[PDB]
Amino acid sequence: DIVLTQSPATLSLSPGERATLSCRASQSVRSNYLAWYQQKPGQAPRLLIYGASNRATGVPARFSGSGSGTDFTLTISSLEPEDFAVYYCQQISNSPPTFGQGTKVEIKRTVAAPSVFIFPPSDEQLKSGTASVVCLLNNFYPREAKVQWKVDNALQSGNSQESVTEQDSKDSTYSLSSTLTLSKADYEKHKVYACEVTHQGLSSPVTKSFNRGEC
Amino acid sequence: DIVLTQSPATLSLSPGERATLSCRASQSVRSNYLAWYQQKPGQAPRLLIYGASNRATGVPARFSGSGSGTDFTLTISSLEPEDFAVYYCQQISNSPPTFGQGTKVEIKRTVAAPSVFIFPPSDEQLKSGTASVVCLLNNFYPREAKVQWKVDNALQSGNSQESVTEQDSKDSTYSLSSTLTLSKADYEKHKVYACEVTHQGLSSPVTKSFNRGEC
Amino acid sequence: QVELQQSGPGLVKPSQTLSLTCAISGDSVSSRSASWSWIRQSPGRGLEWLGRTYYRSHWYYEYAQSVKSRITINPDTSKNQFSLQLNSVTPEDTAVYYCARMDVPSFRYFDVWGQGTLVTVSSASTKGPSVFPLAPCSSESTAALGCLVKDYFPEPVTVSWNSGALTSGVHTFPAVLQSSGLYSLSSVVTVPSSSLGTKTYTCNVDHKPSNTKVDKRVESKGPSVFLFPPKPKDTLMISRTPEVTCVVVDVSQEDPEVQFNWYVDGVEVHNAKTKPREEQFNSTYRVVSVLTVLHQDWLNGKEYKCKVSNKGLPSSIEKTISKAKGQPREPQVYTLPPSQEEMTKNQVSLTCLVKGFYPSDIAVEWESNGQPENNYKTTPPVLDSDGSFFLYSRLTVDKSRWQEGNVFSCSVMHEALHNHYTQKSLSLS
Amino acid sequence: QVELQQSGPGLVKPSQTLSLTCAISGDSVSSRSASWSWIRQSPGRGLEWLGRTYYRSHWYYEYAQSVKSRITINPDTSKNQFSLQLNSVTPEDTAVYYCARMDVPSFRYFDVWGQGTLVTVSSASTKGPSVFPLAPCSSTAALGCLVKDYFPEPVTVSWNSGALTSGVHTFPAVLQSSGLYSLSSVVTVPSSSLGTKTYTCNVDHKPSNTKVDKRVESGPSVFLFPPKPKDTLMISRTPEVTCVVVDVSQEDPEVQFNWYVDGVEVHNAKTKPREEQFNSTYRVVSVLTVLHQDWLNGKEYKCKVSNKGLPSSIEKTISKAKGQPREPQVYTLPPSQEEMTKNQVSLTCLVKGFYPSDIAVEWESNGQPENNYKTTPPVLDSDGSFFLYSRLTVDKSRWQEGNVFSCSVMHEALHNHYTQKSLSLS
Ligand SMILES: *[C@@H]1O[C@H](CO[C@@H]2O[C@@H](C)[C@@H](O)[C@@H](O)[C@@H]2O)[C@@H](O[C@@H]2O[C@H](CO)[C@@H](O[C@@H]3O[C@H](CO[C@H]4O[C@H](CO)[C@@H](O)[C@H](O)[C@@H]4O[C@@H]4O[C@H](CO)[C@@H](O)[C@H](O)[C@H]4NC(C)=O)[C@@H](O)[C@H](O[C@H]4O[C@H](CO)[C@@H](O)[C@H](O)[C@@H]4O)[C@@H]3O)[C@H](O)[C@H]2NC(C)=O)[C@H](O)[C@H]1NC(C)=O
Ligand SMILES: *[C@@H]1O[C@H](CO[C@@H]2O[C@@H](C)[C@@H](O)[C@@H](O)[C@@H]2O)[C@@H](O[C@@H]2O[C@H](CO)[C@@H](O[C@@H]3O[C@H](CO[C@H]4O[C@H](CO)[C@@H](O)[C@H](O)[C@@H]4O[C@@H]4O[C@H](CO)[C@@H](O)[C@H](O)[C@H]4NC(C)=O)[C@@H](O)[C@H](O[C@H]4O[C@H](CO)[C@@H](O)[C@H](O)[C@@H]4O)[C@@H]3O)[C@H](O)[C@H]2NC(C)=O)[C@H](O)[C@H]1NC(C)=O
Ligand SMILES: [Ca+2]
Ligand SMILES: [Ca+2]
């Protein structure tokens, strides 16, 4: 099978900048049989370029393909925030059709501090015997963030899980959830539940808390 | 002097039960000169029966006196919670008038767990150089209760005093205060002040606490 | 526009058969120009073509070597669809499966794709989710609400708010597989705090594997100024219009309407074009005022002061901009061919050294055969020990284009040049 | 109705005289059927009759044998009162004293009694109480008052001038080791009422003439700099992270620095003293030495800045750029032939395709450093890597003589963090 090696694996650039994506084939590929695809989260890949240099239907003019033989290039003349996606090259010069491993394009933007929110477990979940305490970090940039759980000022470990959204196609931010899971018994043992957030956009850590019994 | 011997010294009964109180005289007593009194906490004795068998003014029908010579009886046909009192017999058959030593009537009721409250010393007192920490056990039954003071989880000894109210005339409960006394210096040395309550009505001991500096 | 609609269960027990169907609309399964294909995607293995069925006066079938012993792709001309059958599945078959149209014999691109089916290989039974509200315990203009969706299997769930009416500010997190072997996720939304007392918020969770739809009502209890100079090219060309730009950011909704007052060498001017307030994604406002500048006025060192007044500031914010003061010095322009060591690459670098210029305001562009070349980057001007500036511009070209003898040119626009322009050519000797 | 009202001090010094008065309402002190009596009560001795005064066409007096030598009971027909005088008291006289009417010759019962006077036999001085509120630190709430360090008993405690009686518990006083009494009075009330309703304890201590009504209620900027690229790449050099605090005011307390390596506090930073700037603000710098491999492996360095005494702070965290490192390609370019008309010519070093941007570029010739150069900052390229150019100015005579010039590059992605590329006239 023909192997397609894409470079760089990740590309972080600001809107308005030119993006250059490389695809190197292990064997010569006939130009008519080299295509580029764009894949956004939760969607199938979208045909962007076919026959190495032909823009597919409805594809904006900022996207262009070039190259021949073993070296192909996808150029984004001026990046837009909605261009956040994974870009794949694909060949069918020799069967079977094969794809590259992709270049993930990340959009650079100015630093944005997260808006922090804390949610106590509902009375309904408490009756079931489990307490899930949720901390939300909303619309921040860069992706790097530190979340610390403090239960009656005592630092928590191994009882929390994090989830992060994919970069927003419009404002280029991320959001994060941190969930602290305790049994109903362990939850009723303490009063102050707090989540402490550290981020580049914050001059000092932000703490959001609630007292069990005041909810 | 004529000696009046009352039995039993204490009588513990439920409302609705019959109460039989005995008064035995050391010399024969003329029936017209034998009286019974009821004394409630903080009050003077109230004339209940005069001339061995006459109900005094405003005295309910459940109270009756009987006997002659050296043996007299006060009967409460059906005990009421407000009947909690000390009952005394008195003679004036021969001068000087003398009284019996009394029968204390206690009211039996269902078990009631105390409601526990902790009070830090006031800023006003702290200024004077003394810290009095007060623990309240409210409206409980039976009287038996254990109060333990813990200062930074360390058990206290010889620095606390207890005080109990008399049985309530309506709900037949008791209330208790436990006061922990420390110097201002010894008080500022520690953070967690706790009172642990053990009682028949509580499945497990109840702890009420405060952190000095949060008040 | 041709559509592919996928159907079939994603949850398959180990050793059993995966069966999916792709319904075609807008094209025929018997098309002599198309190949009806299946492609899977997994983290690590990436996109992997499984095979195709295609009609060329006879039905043909082609499969990837790795799955050939277990796969069948069958067309159905009565229902205009095609299926995927993958036998004896193992956890290695867990992936998102797509059907796709490979079209046009000359190009064979995949232009139309199905929505994808998440396939999970597991012996575990299907379990519908439980949904709990996320509401604050008890100043702030925006509030957050949400739903915790948990104890379900397999993935996926679809979460909506107010039956799909509420989409703005919604974040549905990726699910996490818990130690119980069940998934959990939260969906959140930020809304105006004022609306909490009157407006209702309900999350709707759809879990197609268990055929359940769960509803859960969620019940609850500055400015900065930037002043930009004109672009160097604009000031040097009489056909271009130079302008100074005053930008105000972090304007609040509560305290809007900004006052723009300009000063050319201290003299107030009233020809600026102020654009209306534009709401930003972060709920602030941005206001822009543009002042057309006279070419010679900028070049002669005139000062442009922008005064901004708003309720957010007690003292009015002022910014002043002008060209660098000092005697203008003519840039020397030299073109350098690629190094012989770079000739081993498919792409080579063409260098333009521009030095001895003052002030640092300059424009550098590249062209070939009377057309602009855009695959270049120019360094910022750098201060030299003699007080003048230098920079380099690098144009990346295909080695073939350079070797063919094509002439490339570096154009430079600076105030100290004759007619504000110079061009230097570079070609293979 | 017939009533008896008692008055007189209860505190009596040993060997001195107890004097109490009983005021009669609804009957006459001269009644031919009544005997105006005094009875005392103490734990242990119980109820004990002391004596009587009675009028039967003449005033008569009868006393208990035990007190006969020390007692007098005197009627007052002008005020309708009768007194008790008990001389030479001892601690055995400590008791509650009641006046009472003994009535009807046929029965002689005690039907009417005074309220009682608590009599304490003690040499100790009268002391008024100190009253403190009892309120929780943070459906039903409890409030109270601590009535402390008074003598003798009793005190009267009421709530809201007698309006509040339900849920009130006034505890018996306890005699402390100091010889002073202490008690608490509590009340439970609805928690909802706490915001609107006021609660006041009224403490009356008649011996000290005290009545207490106690209401029961309940700048600078920080910049954090990474090490110099050459310092992290040479084991003989010392890489360091620099924390700079600007816009410190003269009156500001000492700037304190706390440093952390992946969250772990370190104590080896070297903090320099405050320095005044030309704009009258002060600048403070703290320098932390870092280990070469820790920086290259992506460890996080945190500087926390605060002022001595004050609780607020500013924090900054730094670490190496995230992303895959890429080896720079180094190319030397000779001067343009058009530049050969000058006494000095430019030698160019193109360094491209590197990641991260942290790099060091120098020049040499004949084993000696060449210092007449300038290097552009790294420039981000369209492929996410960086490039730069370095320009060494040399005398044309030195270039034409065939001297070999070298561009040296130090970068983490190079073998041994070093590469050199030569350039000479050929
Ligand atoms: C709420 O959101 C606002 C909008 O943000 C934008 O949209 C979001 C969705 C993201 O995509 C963001 O990345 C994006 O910016 C924020 O506004 C931004 O505020 C910051 C300050 O906090 C501003 O930073 C300043 O930027 C100057 C450079 O600005 C030019 O370049 C930017 C790209 O790099 C571009 O976005 C700008 O539009 C601007 O572009 C130039 O415009 C002129 C005039 O039209 C043209 O002639 C030029 O050709 C354009 N050039 C380019 C390259 O396109 C910096 O110069 C400035 O730095 C200076 O000051 C600081 C001190 O503050 C010094 O330290 C420094 O040394 C220097 O002197 C500063 O960094 C940014 O410009 C704002 N963005 C816009 C579009 O206006 C809000 O901040 C945010 N609020 C909150 C609370 O989150
Ligand atoms: C009162 O005066 C103070 C002193 O000013 C100095 O002296 C006067 C006489 C003038 O000559 C000044 O130009 C000079 O700065 C002022 O302090 C300065 O405050 C500003 C903020 O207001 C600081 O700006 C920040 O600078 C960072 C870069 O700083 C490096 O580079 C500077 C030269 O470009 C250099 O002066 C600095 O010393 C520093 O140098 C590095 O130091 C490290 C550690 O020792 C070395 O390892 C490096 O090799 C040095 N590198 C070089 C090139 O020499 C910027 O990174 C920073 O920007 C970031 O944040 C802003 C937001 O604030 C973003 O917008 C931006 O995009 C970016 O992310 C910022 O611009 C400046 O550094 C301070 N100067 C010093 C020397 O500390 C006071 O501000 C002033 N007060 C008032 C009220 O006027
Ligand atoms: Ca077709
Ligand atoms: Ca390395």
Tab-separated table of C-alpha atoms in Angstrom, chain C residues 218-386:
chain	number	residue	atom	x	y	z
C	218	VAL	CA	-33.187	22.650	35.567
C	219	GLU	CA	-34.563	24.779	38.416
C	220	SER	CA	-32.564	27.493	40.173
C	221	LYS	CA	-33.114	29.238	43.577
C	222	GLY	CA	-12.470	48.425	31.628
C	223	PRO	CA	-12.006	49.810	28.052
C	224	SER	CA	-8.597	49.715	26.285
C	225	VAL	CA	-7.451	51.861	23.320
C	226	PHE	CA	-5.083	50.869	20.463
C	227	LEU	CA	-3.816	53.329	17.824
C	228	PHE	CA	-2.463	51.914	14.543
C	229	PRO	CA	-0.288	53.724	11.936
C	230	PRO	CA	-0.983	53.614	8.155
C	231	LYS	CA	0.492	50.723	6.152
C	232	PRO	CA	3.952	51.793	4.712
C	233	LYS	CA	2.805	51.038	1.089
C	234	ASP	CA	-0.270	53.338	1.467
C	235	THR	CA	1.830	56.421	2.497
C	236	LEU	CA	4.238	55.970	-0.500
C	237	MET	CA	1.636	55.529	-3.290
C	238	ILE	CA	-0.516	58.548	-4.321
C	239	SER	CA	-3.150	56.054	-5.725
C	240	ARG	CA	-3.485	54.493	-2.197
C	241	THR	CA	-5.246	56.001	0.857
C	242	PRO	CA	-3.233	56.052	4.131
C	243	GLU	CA	-5.221	56.004	7.364
C	244	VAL	CA	-4.665	55.943	11.138
C	245	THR	CA	-6.945	53.570	13.071
C	246	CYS	CA	-8.222	54.059	16.630
C	247	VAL	CA	-9.654	50.846	18.154
C	248	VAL	CA	-11.546	50.674	21.476
C	249	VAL	CA	-12.018	47.221	23.064
C	250	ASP	CA	-13.696	45.982	26.314
C	251	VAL	CA	-16.582	48.482	25.958
C	252	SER	CA	-19.366	47.199	28.275
C	253	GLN	CA	-23.081	46.908	27.284
C	254	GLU	CA	-24.083	48.853	30.481
C	255	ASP	CA	-21.735	51.807	29.670
C	256	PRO	CA	-21.668	52.159	25.811
C	257	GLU	CA	-21.415	55.145	23.334
C	258	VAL	CA	-17.736	56.209	22.991
C	259	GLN	CA	-16.607	59.741	22.017
C	260	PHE	CA	-13.840	59.989	19.356
C	261	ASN	CA	-11.845	63.273	19.244
C	262	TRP	CA	-8.833	63.588	16.900
C	263	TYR	CA	-5.830	66.011	16.968
C	264	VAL	CA	-3.462	66.559	13.977
C	265	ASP	CA	-0.472	68.346	15.670
C	266	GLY	CA	-2.944	69.435	18.425
C	267	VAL	CA	-5.525	70.833	15.918
C	268	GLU	CA	-8.962	69.120	16.094
C	269	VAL	CA	-10.150	67.493	12.814
C	270	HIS	CA	-13.712	66.320	11.995
C	271	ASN	CA	-13.266	64.115	8.853
C	272	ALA	CA	-12.818	60.748	10.722
C	273	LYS	CA	-15.182	57.863	9.881
C	274	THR	CA	-16.419	56.211	13.095
C	275	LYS	CA	-18.011	52.762	12.683
C	276	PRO	CA	-20.902	51.643	14.973
C	277	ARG	CA	-20.403	49.404	18.080
C	278	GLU	CA	-19.745	45.716	17.284
C	279	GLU	CA	-20.607	43.044	19.851
C	280	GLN	CA	-17.812	40.539	20.424
C	281	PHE	CA	-18.103	36.785	21.223
C	282	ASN	CA	-16.873	37.549	24.816
C	283	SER	CA	-19.967	39.863	25.391
C	284	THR	CA	-17.916	43.124	25.195
C	285	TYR	CA	-18.115	45.780	22.424
C	286	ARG	CA	-15.461	46.997	19.965
C	287	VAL	CA	-15.568	50.486	18.323
C	288	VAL	CA	-13.333	51.644	15.431
C	289	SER	CA	-12.624	55.202	14.165
C	290	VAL	CA	-10.637	55.625	10.916
C	291	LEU	CA	-8.882	58.919	10.039
C	292	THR	CA	-7.668	59.415	6.416
C	293	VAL	CA	-4.184	60.910	6.564
C	294	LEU	CA	-2.468	63.058	3.898
C	295	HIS	CA	0.579	61.192	2.415
C	296	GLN	CA	2.962	64.193	2.850
C	297	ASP	CA	1.559	65.006	6.340
C	298	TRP	CA	2.500	61.515	7.661
C	299	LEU	CA	5.877	61.585	5.800
C	300	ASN	CA	6.663	65.069	7.307
C	301	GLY	CA	6.247	63.762	10.889
C	302	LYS	CA	2.776	65.072	11.846
C	303	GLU	CA	1.344	63.741	15.143
C	304	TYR	CA	-2.052	62.004	15.213
C	305	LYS	CA	-3.719	61.981	18.639
C	306	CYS	CA	-6.822	59.903	19.400
C	307	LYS	CA	-8.871	60.902	22.477
C	308	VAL	CA	-11.467	58.345	23.673
C	309	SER	CA	-14.181	59.213	26.232
C	310	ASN	CA	-16.521	56.621	27.849
C	311	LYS	CA	-18.296	56.095	31.248
C	312	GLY	CA	-15.885	53.183	31.930
C	313	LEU	CA	-12.974	55.681	32.210
C	314	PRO	CA	-12.943	58.822	34.463
C	315	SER	CA	-9.814	60.277	32.736
C	316	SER	CA	-10.241	60.234	28.902
C	317	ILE	CA	-7.776	57.748	27.280
C	318	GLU	CA	-5.336	59.365	24.809
C	319	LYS	CA	-2.897	57.768	22.337
C	320	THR	CA	-0.541	59.638	19.946
C	321	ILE	CA	1.179	58.219	16.838
C	322	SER	CA	3.682	59.649	14.275
C	323	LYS	CA	6.458	58.483	11.902
C	324	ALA	CA	9.950	58.000	13.491
C	325	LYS	CA	11.981	61.239	13.614
C	326	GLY	CA	15.415	61.278	12.011
C	327	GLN	CA	17.127	61.696	8.640
C	328	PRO	CA	15.763	59.260	5.967
C	329	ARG	CA	18.378	56.793	4.602
C	330	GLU	CA	18.082	54.914	1.280
C	331	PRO	CA	17.856	51.075	1.452
C	332	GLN	CA	20.430	48.942	-0.458
C	333	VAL	CA	18.702	45.880	-2.013
C	334	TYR	CA	20.575	42.614	-2.770
C	335	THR	CA	19.192	39.294	-4.060
C	336	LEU	CA	20.893	36.036	-2.982
C	337	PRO	CA	20.263	32.696	-4.758
C	338	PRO	CA	19.652	29.437	-2.788
C	339	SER	CA	22.660	27.748	-1.185
C	340	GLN	CA	23.941	24.735	-3.242
C	341	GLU	CA	23.265	22.628	-0.066
C	342	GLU	CA	19.532	23.497	-0.357
C	343	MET	CA	19.400	22.129	-3.980
C	344	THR	CA	18.804	18.584	-2.558
C	345	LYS	CA	15.232	19.731	-1.579
C	346	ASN	CA	11.982	19.983	-3.612
C	347	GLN	CA	11.720	23.626	-2.434
C	348	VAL	CA	14.455	26.307	-2.338
C	349	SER	CA	14.846	29.752	-0.713
C	350	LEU	CA	15.293	33.011	-2.642
C	351	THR	CA	16.709	35.727	-0.361
C	352	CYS	CA	16.337	39.502	-0.491
C	353	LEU	CA	18.631	41.501	1.803
C	354	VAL	CA	17.415	45.089	2.374
C	355	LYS	CA	19.789	47.234	4.472
C	356	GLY	CA	20.810	50.792	5.429
C	357	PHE	CA	17.233	52.146	5.536
C	358	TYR	CA	15.677	54.741	7.900
C	359	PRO	CA	12.900	55.015	9.129
C	360	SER	CA	12.021	51.299	9.605
C	361	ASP	CA	8.637	51.719	7.688
C	362	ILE	CA	9.041	49.658	4.524
C	363	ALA	CA	7.137	47.315	2.175
C	364	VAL	CA	8.731	44.232	0.548
C	365	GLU	CA	6.973	42.059	-2.053
C	366	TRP	CA	7.947	39.353	-4.562
C	367	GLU	CA	6.856	38.785	-8.164
C	368	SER	CA	7.537	36.526	-11.183
C	369	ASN	CA	6.380	36.869	-14.831
C	370	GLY	CA	4.431	40.070	-13.959
C	371	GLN	CA	2.406	38.290	-11.233
C	372	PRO	CA	2.743	38.478	-7.392
C	373	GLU	CA	4.473	35.594	-5.583
C	374	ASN	CA	2.844	35.071	-2.156
C	375	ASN	CA	4.865	32.167	-0.637
C	376	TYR	CA	7.202	34.502	1.298
C	377	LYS	CA	7.963	35.762	4.818
C	378	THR	CA	9.887	38.907	5.711
C	379	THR	CA	11.741	39.445	8.980
C	380	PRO	CA	10.859	42.562	11.045
C	381	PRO	CA	13.363	45.462	10.532
C	382	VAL	CA	16.420	45.035	12.819
C	383	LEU	CA	18.495	47.949	14.203
C	384	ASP	CA	22.102	48.018	12.891
C	385	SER	CA	25.109	49.495	14.826
C	386	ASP	CA	25.034	52.595	12.528
